[PDB]
Amino acid sequence: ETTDGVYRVMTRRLLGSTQVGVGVMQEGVFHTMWHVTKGAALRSGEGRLDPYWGDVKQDLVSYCGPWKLDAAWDGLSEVQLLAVPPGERAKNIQTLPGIFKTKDGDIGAVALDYPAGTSGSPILDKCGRVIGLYGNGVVIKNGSYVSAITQGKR
Amino acid sequence: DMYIERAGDITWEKDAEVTGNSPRLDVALDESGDFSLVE
Ligand SMILES: CCC(=O)N[C@@H](CCCCN)C(=O)N[C@@H](CCCCN)C(=O)NCCCCCNC(=N)N
């Protein structure tokens, strides 16, 4: 299957079937975070998806083609995490991003806490465009989790 | 060996639950792709 949409990334190497992450199929390319697959090939039914581009520092990887997602947070509006937790139905969570301030610029960040296997879930703007992927972040003084809105370059 | 399974369309949900705050955080990104808090 190559239909656009959000997909679970599963493995049967561990006990039972384990969800290690999530990703986005768009324009024939599968997008997820590097730490989910570590750059390894993927199976899609009887087909094979080979890695095409990846970068550990960005924590991103694309399959079958170059990175296609290029929408960006507008810095003002609420967004929605389309969270796909392990063993649970996809659900939209609306939030106003905060900001990661870095020496190389600012990026949006979402203060939402989900299981590790939710890594790669897409964050969307009000037009439904994917502005980044969830799952690379920091733990705050409160112990809470905050994920960068991680977007590639098209 | 990993495989993918479709989980839905990518669409905005009109009546989604709304939660989460909006912290402004000084962070650093290292060569391994890990973010750290700068304090
Ligand atoms: C589970 C511990 C944790 O939050 N790790 C952080 C990284 C902190 C780095 C500090 N220098 C993280 O972002 N992990 C990534 C994997 C490493 C990505 C590496 N590029 C992860 O499993 N994300 C999915 C959501 C996990 C939510 C955890 N929630 C709490 N810790 N309360």
Domain spans in chain A, listed from the N-terminal domain onward: 1-69, 70-154
Quote the ligand 1 centre to B35 CA distance (angstroms): 9
Please report where in the chains the tokens 């493995």 appear, as a residue. Answer: A11
Active-site residue identified among A31, A59, A62, A147: A59
Of A117, A144, A92, nearest to A33 by C-alpha is A117
- The size of chain B, in residues, is 39
- Please give the structure tokens belonging to residue B32: 């391994």
What φ, ψ does residue A34 adopt, rounded to 5°? Answer: -55, -40
Q: What's this structure's resolution in Å?
A: 1.8
- For chain A, the C-alpha Rg in angstroms (whole number) is 15
Residue A85 to residue B14: CA distance in whole angstroms: 20
Q: How far is CA A26 from CA A17, A97, A143, in A?
A: 25, 24, 34
Residue A77 to residue A5: CA distance in whole angstroms: 23
H helices then E strands: how many in chain A?
1, 15
In the chain, the amino acid numbered B13 is E
Residue A149 to residue A71: CA distance in whole angstroms: 11
Of A149, A125, A120, nearest to A137 by C-alpha is A149
Q: Which chain A residues contact residue B35 at CB under 8 A?
A: 100, 136-138, 148
- Please tell me the residue having the least CA distance from ligand 1 atom 14: A136
H/E/C letters for each residue in A27-96? CCEEEECHHHHCCCCEEECCEEECEEEEECCCCEEEECCCCCCCCCCCCCCCEEEEECCCCCCCEEEEEC
CA A47 to mean position of chain CA atoms: 22
Q: Is there a contact between B35 and A148 if contact means CB atoms under 8 Å apart?
A: yes
Q: Where are the domains of chain B?
A: 1-39
CB atoms within 10 A of CB A66: 12
In the chain, the amino acid numbered A3 is T
Of B33, B6, B16, nearest to A30 by C-alpha is B6
If DSSP codes are grouped into helix, strand and coil, which group holds residue A118? helix
Name the β-bridge partners of A148.
Answer: A109
Q: How far is CA A37 from CA A26, A41, A131, in A?
A: 18, 8, 21
A117 DSSP 8-state letter: G
Of A28, A51, A130, A85, nearest to B7 by C-alpha is A85
Of B36, B25, B9, nearest to A7 by C-alpha is B9
CB atoms within 10 A of CB B9: 12
